[PDB]
Amino acid sequence: GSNSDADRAALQKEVAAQQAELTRISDTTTFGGRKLLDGSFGTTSFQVG
Amino acid sequence: GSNSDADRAALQKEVAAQQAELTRISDTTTFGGRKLLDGSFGTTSFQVG
Numbered sequence A, B: 001g002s003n004s005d006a007d008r009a010a011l012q013k014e015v016a017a018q019q020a021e022l023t024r025i026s027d028t029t030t031f032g033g034r035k036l037l038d039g040s041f042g043t044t045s046f047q048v049g
Helices: A008-026 B006-024
Strands: none
Touching: none
């Protein structure tokens, strides 16, 4: 309501913790010590023939 | 997967051992101390007439 919740400090802290959690989900997906979604993914290609 | 198995070092060791076993199969065919495939084979001709 632009004037009701003066708790904007903890609100920004909440969304900042959520962004940090997102950055963590980016990492910790190391299927082979080669974390998939984040970092530098080599744009691989699986040979099937 | 072009990036999934970082154990390509042991993979190379495996392939090199397979190649060395191939070269050993080439040797050790000393049918008379005249190993057929490698070593010294004169590419001779068997007389039958």
